[PDB]
Amino acid sequence: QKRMLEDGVFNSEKLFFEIRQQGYTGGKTILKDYMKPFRETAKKKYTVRYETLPGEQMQVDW
């Protein structure tokens, strides 16, 4: 967590290689699963559609 939140490392291979020296012996799946929430949420592509009521909304832009 310190690595992710202060060094900005999100490479599962790098973190796995680091902690393996510390003593970890398991696989990378648990690491990826634990680290997934910290990763940034990629923007969606689905786009909701809305139909405003008559004489109820207007939009402005430059």
Place this chain on the structure above:
DNA sequence: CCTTCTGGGGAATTTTAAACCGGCGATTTTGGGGAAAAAATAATCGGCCTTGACAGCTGCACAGTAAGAGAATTATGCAGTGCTGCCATAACCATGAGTGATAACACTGCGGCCAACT
């Protein structure tokens, strides 16, 4: 002309079939304890499938509001000086109490002297 046979009906009795209720023998069910197996849940493992990024980099422009940095100005608090009055302290004498001092013995610290090694 008469006698005997037979048939119907009411009353008494007997037997067998049916239904209920109780008693007796058997299985079931509930509870607790111990063992074994199944399944559920969580964690860990390997690997496949798919796609994002890496391609010079990001600083600036405008919009509005607010903050702040520097300089000038103003307000105020401290300080300085003079004169007068009041309170504190200090100076002396007396008496009591505490501590520094003095005597004596014992233990320890420091300086002078002797010897051993390089």
